[PDB]
């Protein structure tokens, strides 16, 4: 039996695609926490990005004259 | 054929945004008619619509509890 | 009838398409073009026999 | 300015639809449906201010500018229906809306597979080819020296008769074919 | 007060804007009750035809006829030449055809001397 | 080998055996869109296998299997270029379309031409991929006229409103402007190359390259609607939903794109063609997002979305970065063709509404198209790890680090926030809040057509990226050192997009009637652009082809 | 097939099936489904067909063109001899064609044998093909839509009157 | 989708529209209830009532047609003629 | 059709200018020709230039998709402004100010695009340092040549 | 099926099979594969000046 | 139940038109792609060789598909 | 992208310019500095068929990371330490070019302060 049209009030609700939508719903926030959980870096970043006056002039062949 | 309509005696506009809507028109003196026709939209399964970070958040609660199985199934299988 | 639709859509098809390119096409000079495979340090020649030798050794940074 | 049986719009039909399209376009300016409600009456309020004026003269400035108000507050893309002209599934079917002498030219073996539906058919034209001269002299004698004054048509005055120039109003195509 | 509306020529006025629209004298009454009755005499005219069920063809229109008569015939023999045809067919007649002839003429001039000089690219130019 | 380039053919053929079909018809047919699905599935299937075996080795190759002309130095052979392009555009457009004609078995079942709409859409599917695959400039030309007519037939298909045969002319105007540009790179290789093959002109790279990709670039102008020739895909979403969803969003649209991408090692020589498509992307993704914040047609917001997406791709091929570029179409294709569906879903299924001020209450009326509204918006954002992650914060992430118009940079950032804006815009006006569709509800979803097909491009839109991004090898150096205010730039731009717009919909609960601002009046009427030169240039055009063209010379002078 | 020099194919390289993980590709799979599905039942109609060719072997033959006196050994306005030379010239202006054709094969299948190599690996036949252009276009270039052996000897010798000062004008 | 409209339902629909509506007292409204001579409504409270079925069946009525609707049986009958019913 | 129904030359007599009107089916008062210049309009009637977009879509058309009835006269461009092409309906903001707000917007975008071009940015970060000179022999350099020493040394 | 079977329209086929004989002839010799005079630059008597 | 009547032209003239098209094309379609597999099946396509010392071949031996060589030989 | 600022609202003397640079020599400062070691043969990267701009003084590990993406087919997440390795050599590159942007920088630094104390001195 189909769904019966309505008139001025809420309409009749499938079982099925209900527990369906949550569950792609619960996929999609899943999906998020487990790469967000084992990648970190893609959003965050991978990599220090370190300070340029924070290196000494001995590495950088500054003498000073 | 017949499509049986509700009753237009349930319609009413007390506890709806059209109560606030009469009464702060009833303070100039205007008086709403049309919000028992509006009525059906604020009231009965379309009452108590989700915001937008609760419309975002659909699943979020099953999916982080399968979240944190996966998390200490694998955190119980690596050792 | 069950599968007719695999029978007559795709293996007569590639039947057809595998005659085409084994007999008239690949008979005739630099029709189909491949690039060439990626060799890497290590692999093995299959036409020769002849081993890759390997990269330098790495002057390790971790 | 334009319309089938008056050459005018009367000052009440100017104000009646300067009304709606006001509410109209701001129902496209007030999405919601309890603020466009309360902005409804509170419009309401304000078309009801000036109902009572006896002065045309008068109430033609107040009507010429409230059309300057309703102008400088429209919408730029007002809520259309979608079978209203300039909507999106506006006259969207008229691509299947096939006329019916198109069925005439049918070839008789299609015509066969259908027998009860050009059975009928053929006494609905005969229907229309007697009456047709009775509602032509019908017309030449209601309508006045110079032609009609008015588009509207007389309806079928005697019993028996049909309507004048009925055949494409009611043989017309479906709106969803 | 309010920002009036300009019309345009390709964004006319609104009918509500017009002040004409707003005229309730008689000699309107007597222009738009006129202009009615000529609409309904040839509504009438075409519709006597139109469901007509002894006519199976097209029902001329012979606005439509003398459009196109209009369109196609009339332009030759109402020709006057003055100084405005003259001009006109002057100007759009053979303006842009000495344009593009110097244009083309000047780019040619310009390839050619760059080739006999050397100078143009013509390494992988075979196919011409 | 004997497996790659016969299961390429035999895609290809497979495509045009419906056709074939259809053409040599006496009975009505035993469900003739289930059988066009169902051969679009195997095609699907049988072009995994060159992708899969791509994947393991690198193999590329050329199939000029049919001698077909010799212009006295120019050998025009049908020749298919199978590299990493084709193997990853022909999956991912099987794949959307066999969702697309799923999802069409549903929508289109009320219209008694569905054969012929099914066989229109297998025709544009082969013209495209044709255009994908193809090796000279002459068949990529025959992919792309074919494209461009089947876009005219798919728009005007309900051919007796005068809108869509009026938008159908619209878009073909456009895109023969975008062709006078292609017409001129062929001219200028056929000249200076002596070639229309791709290898002659790569393995020549000529240095003097200004004018080809001049003419490239008003290619794609005309056919990806960059600024100046755009407006014909708002125009366009007068046709049906499918139409929108496959051609007009995801799949012939990226075709100057993938013009541009195709030609990158011209692109990658030339500084000043990667500056003028970083400023032509820049202006395009600026002007369409902006457009779309002020619209209440849902498919004019959608076709907004992926011309503003296009706009990027521009952009990011304007860094000097092509395979992000097509990693952003393949990607993009699954979330666009989704939030078509689901919004023609809404549209369906509330009796042809398409104005977002008349929708609402459908958070739990439709759960599902809910569900794959706000995954398919996500996706479009840049929500962490969706498949639109996987691309378009890379975008970001070497439109930042790069020797970049830094006035680009910036609208590309404002495009970026305006994203979010619109796609919360279309959730809080069409799912959230209470109803204001009319009273007699006929709300449904559940016919397995549509809900398979938007699960299959769900799973995509959730996964693809991934998936794709770990199976695609490195073309290029991916940038992965910088700042960590410039590592969180996309994301931060985003939610303030999100929190901006969340503060826009909560002030219009408010009772209050405000007169209209002027950025409103720009935004609304879109830019003023679509209502004077549709307006003037035609005016100027046909009175002068009636006046002194007809008229004055062609009758009286002359 | 063809001819290997005109045609030349250096030779190729494959690496060997090195399997490191312990998943089995389709790729093997789908390989030996091919190869008994698709290549045998082919196999056997090929050399049905070609049994069948072997029952009835006939030949064609390439035809040739002995050289007759070109354009220069012609007397003025003598048909007879000058249109031997131009429908001899005709044939040598369309083999130059094909000539050209080759070349652009060699160059476009070197680019895509080659792959991103292509720059470093196909410097021989981009130099070839730049030596075959410039005669091509040396001998075949500007002469126009009604060419003929005329307008090709009086650019020869334009180009020789030029090639002869620039002589002269060195020393 | 697309249900067909029957009399009984426009009927029903139109007269239910008109029971929500807080000048027309239920009582007294019937099928042939004119809204100025009858029911006792103002020429904008006639505006509103066929912008409310505009409103209730999801088309538009021009206004030529809107200024002359007076009944609930001409609103019946008016979308009769434009939906088609009773084939 | 017949003659006395076709166009003919200009109306100069006022008596003219009655016939011509009751030819072309109008009052006498709204019939204006084109003005006699010699440009070959002849006695065609001047309509306003209304773009057939413009007219009431709700009324009886005879030609519905055109919004034109049977034996009114078309003005002189009814090929120009069907509703397929040119309009000149009204619109909500001045066709002047959109000019202005058009220009403005499109020019100010191509200064400010020439403004970031003028002035890049990038990455505090020394040129991008590839080995065996500055690959020689990868970017196409001929194997008997050899070219400078490009050298990069350890930072 | 009479113009697919034409044989060799305006000798195209012949012209590329000749050409893969001329080719192979100066390869092979180490000549040049194309000179840039068609005809023989000793049999021909330029103006003097 | 209430199927309603969908008025449309007469597709007979097309259909009939089309049913003809494709019966007289095939007519001699299908024989003709009958014969010519024949003829590359059983007759097959010519080899090249070498002019042998004193045969001077035909002007239709100068070509591989029987069928040119049918018409290099019979009309040209 | 605070040296955008230093570039266009201060001075471009003391900052120095992206599109030529280094202006000092690199023998400057550096009592004998050593080369940087190309790992992977020009023969072996030629072979392995590498892009151009990938070609750089680390194409060895994105070799070793090719080779095992090739051998690791289908499964296509068991190579994550190779390109790890990459990625992170890669980064040690821009580090390293971020070395020699700061060292132009402290040059320029050294010869506007140079000039400086000559105008004050002289
Ligand atoms: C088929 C009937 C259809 C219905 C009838 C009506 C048809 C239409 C009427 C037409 C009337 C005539 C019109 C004029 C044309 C005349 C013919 C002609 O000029 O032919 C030209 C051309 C030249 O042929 P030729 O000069 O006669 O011979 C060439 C050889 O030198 C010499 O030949 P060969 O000796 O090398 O080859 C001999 C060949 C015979 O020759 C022919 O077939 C040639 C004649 C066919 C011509 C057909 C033309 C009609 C139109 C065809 C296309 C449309 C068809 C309908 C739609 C299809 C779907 C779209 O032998 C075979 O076919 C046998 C092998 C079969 C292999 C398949 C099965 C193998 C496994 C079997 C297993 C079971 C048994 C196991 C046990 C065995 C025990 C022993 O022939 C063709 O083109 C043949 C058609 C097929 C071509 C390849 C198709 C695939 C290509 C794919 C890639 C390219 C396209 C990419 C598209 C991308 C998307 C857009
Ligand atoms: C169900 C249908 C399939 C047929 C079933 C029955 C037959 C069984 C299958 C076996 C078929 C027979 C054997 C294989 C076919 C013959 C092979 C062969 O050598 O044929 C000779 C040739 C091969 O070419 P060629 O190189 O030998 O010669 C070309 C001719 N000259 C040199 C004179 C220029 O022809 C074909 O193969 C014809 C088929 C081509 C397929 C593609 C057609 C596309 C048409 C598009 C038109 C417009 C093009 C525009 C684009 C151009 C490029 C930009
Ligand atoms: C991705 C990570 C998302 C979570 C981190 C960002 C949180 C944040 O700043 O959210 C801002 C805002 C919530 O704050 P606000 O709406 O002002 O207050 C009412 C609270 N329900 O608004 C929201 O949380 C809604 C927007 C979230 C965007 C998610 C996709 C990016
Ligand atoms: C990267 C480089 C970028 C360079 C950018 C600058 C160059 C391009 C400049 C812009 C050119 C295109 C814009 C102008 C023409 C647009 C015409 C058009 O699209 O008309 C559409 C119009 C209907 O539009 P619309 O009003 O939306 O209709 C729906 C409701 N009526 O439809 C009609 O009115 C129908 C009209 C039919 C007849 C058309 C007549 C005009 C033809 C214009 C040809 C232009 C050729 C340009 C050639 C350039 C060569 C270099
Ligand atoms: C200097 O600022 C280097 C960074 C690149 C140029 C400036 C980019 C500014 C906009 C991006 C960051 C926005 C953070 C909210």
Same mark, same amino acid.
């Given at each position: 039996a189909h769904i019966e049209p309505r008139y001025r009030q809420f309409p009749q609700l499938t079982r099925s695609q209900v527990i369906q939508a949550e569950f792609f719903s619960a996929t999609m926030w899943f999906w998020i926490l487990w790469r967000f959980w084992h990648d970190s870096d893609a959003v965050l970043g991978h990599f220090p990005y370190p300070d340029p006056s924070q290196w000494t002039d001995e590495e950088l062949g500054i003498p000073p004259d | 054929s017949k499509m049986e309509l509700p009753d237009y005696k349930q319609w009413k506009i007390e506890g709806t945004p059209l109560e606030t809507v009469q009464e702060k028109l009833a303070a100039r003196g205007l008086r709403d008619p049309w919000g028992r026709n509006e009525a059906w939209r604020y009231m009965g399964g379309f009452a108590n619509n989700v915001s937008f970070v609760g419309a975002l958040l659909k699943g979020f609660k099953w999916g982080f509890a399968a979240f944190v199985v996966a998390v200490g199934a694998e955190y119980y299988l690596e050792s | 009838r069950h599968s007719i639709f695999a029978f007559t859509h795709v293996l007569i098809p590639v039947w057809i398409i595998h005659y085409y390119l084994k007999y008239h096409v690949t008979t005739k000079p630099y029709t189909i073009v491949e690039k060439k495979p990626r060799i890497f340090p290590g692999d093995t020649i299959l036409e020769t026999g002849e081993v890759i030798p390997p990269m330098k050794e790495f002057p390790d940074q971790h | 300015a334009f319309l089938p049986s008056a050459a005018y719009l009367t000052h009440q039909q100017k104000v009646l639809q300067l009304y709606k399209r006001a509410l109209r376009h701001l129902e496209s300016r007030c999405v919601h449906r309890d603020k466009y409600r309360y902005f409804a009456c509170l419009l309401r309020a304000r078309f009801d201010e000036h109902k009572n004026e006896k002065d045309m003269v008068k109430a033609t400035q107040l009507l010429r500018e409230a059309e300057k108000e309703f102008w400088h507050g429209q919408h730029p893309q007002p809520y259309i229906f979608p079978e209203s002209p300039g909507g999106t599934s506006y006259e969207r079917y008229e691509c299947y809306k096939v006329p019916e002498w198109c069925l005439d030219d049918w070839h008789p073996s299609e015509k066969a597979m259908y027998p009860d539906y050009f059975a009928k058919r053929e006494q609905w034209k005969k229907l229309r080819r007697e009456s047709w001269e009775r509602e032509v002299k019908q017309l030449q004698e209601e309508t006045p020296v110079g032609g009609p004054r008015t588009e509207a048509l007389p309806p079928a005055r005697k019993q028996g008769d049909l309507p004048p120039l009925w055949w494409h109003i009611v043989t017309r195509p479906r709106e969803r074919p | 007060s309010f920002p009036k509306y300009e019309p345009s020529r390709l964004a006319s006025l609104p009918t509500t804007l017009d002040p004409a629209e707003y005229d309730i004298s008689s000699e309107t009454r007597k222009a738009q009750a006129e202009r009615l009755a000529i609409r309904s005499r040839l509504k009438r005219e075409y519709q006597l035809q139109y469901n007509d069920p002894s006519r199976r063809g097209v029902v001329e229109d012979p606005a439509l006829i003398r459009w196109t008569c209009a369109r196609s015939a009339n332009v030759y023999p109402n020709f006057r030449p003055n100084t405005k045809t003259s001009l006109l067919g002057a100007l759009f007649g053979i303006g842009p055809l000495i344009f593009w002839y110097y244009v083309f003429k000047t780019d040619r001039d310009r390839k050619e001397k760059l080739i006999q000089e050397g100078k143009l690219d013509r390494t992988f130019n075979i196919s011409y | 080998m004997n497996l790659f380039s016969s299961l390429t053919l035999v895609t290809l053929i497979l495509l045009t055996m419906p056709i074939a079909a259809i053409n040599f018809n006496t009975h009505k047919f035993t469900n003739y869109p289930l059988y066009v699905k169902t051969t679009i599935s195997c095609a699907f299937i049988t072009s995994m296998i060159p992708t899969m075996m791509f994947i393991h080795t690198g193999q590329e190759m050329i199939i000029s299997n049919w001698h077909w002309l010799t212009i006295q130095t120019l050998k025009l052979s049908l020749s298919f270029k199978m590299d990493f392009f084709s193997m990853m555009f022909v999956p991912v457009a099987l794949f959307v379309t066999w969702s697309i004609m799923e999802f069409s078995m549903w929508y289109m079942h009320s219209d008694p031409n569905i054969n012929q709409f099914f066989k229109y859409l297998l025709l544009f599917?082969?013209?495209?991929?044709?255009?994908?695959?193809?090796?000279?400039?002459?068949?990529?030309?025959?992919?792309?006229?074919?494209?461009?007519?089947?876009?005219?037939?798919?728009?005007?298909?309900?051919?007796?409103?005068?809108?869509?045969?009026?938008?159908?002319?619209?878009?073909?105007?456009?895109?023969?402007?975008?062709?006078?540009?292609?017409?001129?790179?062929?001219?200028?290789?056929?000249?200076?190359?002596?070639?229309?093959?791709?290898?002659?002109?790569?393995?020549?790279?000529?240095?003097?390259?200004?004018?080809?990709?001049?003419?490239?670039?008003?290619? *794609?102008?005309?056919?990806? *609607?960059?600024?100046?020739?755009?407006?014909?895909?708002?125009? !366009?979403?007068?046709?049906?939903?499918?139409?929108? *969803?496959?051609?007009?969003?995801?799949?012939?649209?990226? !075709?100057?794109?993938?013009?541009?991408?195709?030609?990158?090692?011209?692109?990658?020589?030339?500084?000043?063609?990667?500056?003028?498509?970083?400023?032509?992307?820049?202006?395009?993704?600026?002007?369409?997002?902006?457009?779309?914040?002020?619209?209440?047609?849902?498919?004019?917001?959608?076709?907004?979305?992926?011309?503003?997406?296009?706009?990027?791709?521009?952009?990011?091929?304007?860094?000097?970065?092509?395979?992000?570029?097509?990693?952003?179409?393949?990607?993009?294709?699954?979330?666009?063709?989704?939030?078509?569906?689901?919004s023609g879903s809404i549209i369906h299924s509330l009796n042809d509404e398409?104005?977002?001020?008349?929708?609402?209450?459908?958070?739990?009326?439709?759960?599902?198209?809910?569900?794959?509204?706000?995954?398919?918006?996500? !996706?479009?954002?840049?929500?962490?790890?969706?498949?639109?992650?996987?691309?378009?914060?890379?975008?970001?992430?070497?439109?930042?680090?790069?020797?970049?118009?830094?006035?680009?940079?910036?609208?590309?950032?404002?495009?970026?926030?305006?994203? !979010?804006?619109?796609?919360?815009?279309?959730?809080?006006?069409?799912?959230?809040?209470?109803?204001?569709?009319?009273?007699?509800?006929?709300?449904?979803?559940?016919?397995?057509?549509?809900?398979?097909?938007?699960?299959?491009?769900?799973?995509?839109?959730?996964?693809?990226?991934?998936?794709?991004?770990?199976?695609?090898?490195?073309?290029?150096?991916?940038?992965?050192?910088?700042?960590?205010?410039?590592?969180?730039?996309?994301?931060?731009?985003?939610?303030?997009?999100?929190?901006?717009?969340?503060?826009?919909?909560?002030?219009?609960?408010?009772?209050?009637?405000?007169?209209?601002?002027?950025?409103?009046?720009?935004?609304?009427?879109?830019?003023?652009?679509?209502?004077?030169?549709?307006?003037?240039?035609?005016?100027?055009?046909?009175?002068?082809?009636?006046?002194? *063209?007809?008229?004055?010379?062609?009758?009286?002078?002359? | 097939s063809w001819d290997k020099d005109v045609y030349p194919e250096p030779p190729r390289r494959t690496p060997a099936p090195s399997p490191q993980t312990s998943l089995p590709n389709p790729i093997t799979y789908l390989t030996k489904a091919f190869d008994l599905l698709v290549d045998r039942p082919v196999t056997l109609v090929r050399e049905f067909i070609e049994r069948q060719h072997a029952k009835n072997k006939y030949y064609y033959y390439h035809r040739e063109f002995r050289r007759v006196p070109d354009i220069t050994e012609c007397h003025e306005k003598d048909v007879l001899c000058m249109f031997e030379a131009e429908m001899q010239w005709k044939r040598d202006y369309k083999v130059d064609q094909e000539i050209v054709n080759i070349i652009q094969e060699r160059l476009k299948a070197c680019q895509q044998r080659e792959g991103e190599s292509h720059r470093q690996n196909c410097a021989k036949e981009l130099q070839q093909f730049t030596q075959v252009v410039k005669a091509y276009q040396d001998r075949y270039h500007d002469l126009g839509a009604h060419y003929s052996a005329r307008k090709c000897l009086a650019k020869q010798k334009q180009r020789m009157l030029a090639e002869r000062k620039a002589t002269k004008e060195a020393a | 989708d697309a249900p067909p409209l029957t009399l009984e339902g426009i009927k029903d629909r139109v007269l239910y529209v008109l029971k929500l509506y807080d000048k027309i007292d239920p009582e007294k409204l019937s099928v042939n209830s004119h809204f100025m001579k009858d029911l006792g409504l103002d020429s904008l409270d006639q505006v509103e009532i066929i912008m409310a079925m505009e409103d209730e069946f999801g088309f538009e009525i021009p206004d030529i047609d809107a200024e002359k609707l007076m009944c609930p049986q001409e609103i019946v009958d008016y979308i009769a003629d434009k939906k088609d019913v009773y084939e | 059709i017949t003659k006395d129904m076709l166009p003919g030359p200009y109306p100069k007599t006022p008596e003219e200018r009655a016939a011509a009107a009751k030819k072309y089916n109008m009052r006498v008062e709204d019939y204006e020709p084109y003005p006699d210049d010699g440009m070959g309009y002849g006695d065609y009637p001047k309509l306003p230039d209304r773009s057939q977009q413009e007219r009431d879509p709700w009324y009886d058309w005879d030609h519905p998709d055109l919004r034109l009835n049977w034996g009114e006269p078309m003005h002189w461009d009814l090929d120009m402004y069907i509703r397929n092409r040119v309009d000149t309906s009204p619109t909500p903001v001045n066709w002047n100010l959109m000019c202005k707000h058009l220009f403005g917007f499109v020019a100010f975008m191509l200064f400010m695009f020439w403004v970031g071009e003028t002035y890049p940015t990038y990455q505090p970060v020394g040129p991008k340092q590839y080995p065996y000179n500055n690959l020689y022999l990868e970017r196409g350099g001929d194997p008997n040549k050899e070219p400078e020493p490009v050298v990069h040394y350890e930072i | 099926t009479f113009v697919a079977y034409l044989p060799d329209y305006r000798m195209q086929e012949w012209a590329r099979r000749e050409a893969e004989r001329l080719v192979k002839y100066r390869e092979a010799h180490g000549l040049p594969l194309m000179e840039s005079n068609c005809f023989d630059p000793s049999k021909i008597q330029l103006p003097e000046d | 139940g209430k199927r309603l009547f969908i008025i449309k032209p007469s597709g007979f003239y097309d259909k009939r038109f089309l049913k003809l098209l494709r019966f007289y094309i095939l007519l001699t379609g299908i024989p003709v792609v009958i014969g010519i597999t024949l003829i590359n099946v059983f007759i097959g396509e010519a080899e090249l060789a070498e002019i042998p010392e004193g045969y001077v071949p035909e002007h239709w031996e100068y070509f591989k598909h029987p069928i040119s060589r049918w018409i290099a030989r019979t009309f040209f | 992208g605070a040296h955008l600022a230093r570039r266009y609202l201060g001075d471009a003397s003391v900052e120095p310019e992206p599109l030529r640079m280094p202006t000092f020599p690199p023998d400057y400062g550096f009592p004998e500095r050593k080369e940087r070691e190309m790992v992977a043969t020009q023969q072996e990267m030629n072979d392995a068929q590498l892009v151009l701009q990938q070609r750089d003084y680390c194409a060895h590990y994105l070799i070793r990371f090719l080779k095992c993406k090739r051998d690791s087919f289908p499964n296509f997440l068991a190579c994550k330490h190779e390109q790890h390795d990459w990625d992170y050599c890669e980064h040690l590159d821009y580090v390293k070019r971020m070395k020699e942007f700061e060292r132009e920088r402290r040059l320029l630094q050294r010869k506007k302060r140079r000039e400086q104390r000559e105008a004050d001195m002289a």
């Open positions: - | - | - | - | - | 599917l082969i013209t495209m991929l044709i255009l994908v695959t193809a090796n000279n400039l002459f068949q990529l030309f025959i992919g792309w006229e074919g494209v461009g007519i089947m876009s005219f037939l798919l728009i005007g298909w309900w051919y007796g409103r005068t809108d869509a045969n009026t938008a159908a002319l619209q878009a073909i105007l456009y895109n023969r402007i975008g062709d006078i540009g292609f017409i001129l790179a062929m001219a200028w290789f056929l000249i200076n190359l002596n070639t229309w093959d791709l290898q002659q002109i790569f393995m020549l790279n000529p240095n003097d390259s200004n004018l080809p990709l001049m003419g490239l670039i008003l290619a *794609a102008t005309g056919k990806s *609607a960059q600024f100046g020739l755009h407006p014909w895909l708002p125009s !366009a979403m007068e046709g049906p939903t499918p139409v929108s *969803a496959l051609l007009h969003s995801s799949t012939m649209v990226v !075709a100057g794109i993938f013009l541009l991408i195709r030609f990158y090692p011209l692109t990658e020589n030339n500084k000043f063609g990667q500056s003028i498509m970083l400023c032509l992307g820049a202006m395009t993704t600026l002007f369409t997002a902006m457009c779309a914040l002020t619209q209440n047609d849902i498919k004019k917001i959608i076709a907004f979305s992926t011309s503003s997406q296009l706009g990027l791709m521009m952009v990011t091929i304007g860094i000097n970065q092509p395979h992000l570029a097509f990693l952003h179409i393949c990607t993009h294709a699954f979330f666009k063709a989704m939030l078509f569906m689901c398409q104005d977002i001020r008349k929708m609402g209450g459908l958070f739990k009326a439709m759960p599902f198209t809910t569900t794959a509204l706000i995954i398919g918006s996500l !996706a479009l954002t840049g929500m962490p790890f969706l498949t639109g992650f996987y691309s378009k914060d890379l975008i970001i992430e070497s439109a930042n680090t790069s020797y970049t118009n830094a006035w680009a940079l910036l609208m590309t950032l404002v495009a970026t926030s305006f994203t !979010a804006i619109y796609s919360t815009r279309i959730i809080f006006f069409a799912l959230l809040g209470q109803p204001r569709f009319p009273t007699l509800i006929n709300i449904n979803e559940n016919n397995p057509f549509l809900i398979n097909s938007i699960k299959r491009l769900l799973i995509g839109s959730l996964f693809a990226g991934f998936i794709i991004s770990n199976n695609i090898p490195p073309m290029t150096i991916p940038q992965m050192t910088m700042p960590h205010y410039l590592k969180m730039t996309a994301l931060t731009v985003t939610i303030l997009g999100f929190i901006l717009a969340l503060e826009i919909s909560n002030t219009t609960h408010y009772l209050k009637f405000n007169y209209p601002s002027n950025t409103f009046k720009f935004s609304n009427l879109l830019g003023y652009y679509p209502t004077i030169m549709h307006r003037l240039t035609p005016y100027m055009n046909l009175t002068m082809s009636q006046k002194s *063209a007809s008229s004055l010379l062609d009758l009286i002078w002359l | - | - | - | - | - | -």
